[PDB]
Design a protein around this ligand. Structure first.
Ligand SMILES: [Cu+]
Length: 125
């Protein structure tokens, strides 16, 4: 009921498809950042939304800037997210699986680097 995900200095996650077992009450994402760049240069987060909401979350988040960890304050389209991290840092987020609809289309992504392709899928199986 948890996953360890890495974001690197090349704006890649080390996975692009998360499966959430239906037996899980909660799900945990453990985000880390290999490499050698600070958070104000090459910062990463982990953000969950529906596929439909992703573009708008990313656009509004980018425009909110670093100080706001590239997320629009109190964004209702964000199901779950970590904080923004630099190299050698880590952060975890846990959410209620009850917030997911089984078999539906969810995307995960880093908000400042989604446009560079830092994204993948998540499915309640
Ligand atoms: Cu990123």
């Amino acid at each position: 009921c948890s996953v360890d995900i890495q974001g690197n200095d090349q704006m890649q996650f080390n996975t692009n498809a998360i499966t959430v077992d239906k037996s899980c009450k909660q799900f945990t994402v453990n985000l880390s950042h290999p490499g050698n760049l600070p958070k104000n240069v090459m910062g990463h987060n982990w953000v969950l939304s529906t596929a439909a909401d992703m573009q708008g979350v990313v656009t509004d988040g980018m425009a909110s800037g670093l100080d706001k960890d590239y997320l629009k304050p109190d964004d209702s389209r964000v199901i779950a997210h970590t904080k923004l991290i630099g190299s050698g840092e880590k952060d975890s987020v846990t959410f209620d699986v009850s917030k997911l609809k089984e078999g539906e289309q969810y995307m995960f992504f880093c908000s400042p680097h989604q446009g560079a392709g830092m994204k993948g899928t998540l499915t309640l199986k």
